[PDB]
Amino acid sequence: KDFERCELARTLKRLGMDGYRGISLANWMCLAKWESGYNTRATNYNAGDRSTDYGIFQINSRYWCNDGKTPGAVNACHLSCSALLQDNIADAVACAKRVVRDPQGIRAWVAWRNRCQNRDVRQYVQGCGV
């Protein structure tokens, strides 16, 4: 599904993302916007290292989930990558939390560095009541 901006902001808040490991909801929103346009079914194949990015946060199969077809990959979220393509984003949120528990934090995603870091992100949650 395609989430509407405020619908997603509330869903993420209910799932405990606001301020998770110091990351504001506005940052998570900006990340989802730029990674998938708030679409849960998005997938991106990286022909270079034979990995695939999955779901609303475009979480990568080399490290985070198992799709059985990425050479020498690991599964740090201990989930089938299929779990990251659900309309219900609970599992995807649990995995994104796992990603940020690592040292890089939100910087793990290059898109965040490109479109969200050192930029005004307040616009992503304005008027959503979060």
From Swiss-Prot:
The active site is at E35, D53. One of its GO terms (biological process) is defense response to bacterium. It is an enzyme of class 3 (hydrolase). One of its GO terms (molecular function) is lysozyme activity. SMART domains: LYZ1 (SM00263). Its main location: secreted. It holds the Pfam family Lys. Its EC number is 3.2.1.17. InterPro entries: Glyco_hydro_22, Glyco_hydro_22_CS, Glyco_hydro_22_lys, Lysozyme-like_dom_sf. It catalyses: Hydrolysis of (1->4)-beta-linkages between N-acetylmuramic acid and N-acetyl-D-glucosamine residues in a peptidoglycan and between N-acetyl-D-glucosamine residues in chitodextrins. It is found in: Secreted. Lysozymes have primarily a bacteriolytic function; those in tissues and body fluids are associated with the monocyte-macrophage system and enhance the activity of immunoagents. Monomer. Belongs to the glycosyl hydrolase 22 family. Lysozyme C is capable of both hydrolysis and transglycosylation; it also shows a slight esterase activity. It acts rapidly on both peptide-substituted and unsubstituted peptidoglycan, and slowly on chitin oligosaccharides. It is linked to Amyloidosis, hereditary systemic 5: A form of hereditary systemic amyloidosis, a disorder characterized by amyloid deposition in multiple tissues resulting in a wide clinical spectrum. AMYLD5 primarily affects the viscera, and the predominant clinical features are renal dysfunction of varying severity, and intra-abdominal bleeding. Inheritance is autosomal dominant. This is Lysozyme C. The gene is LYZ.
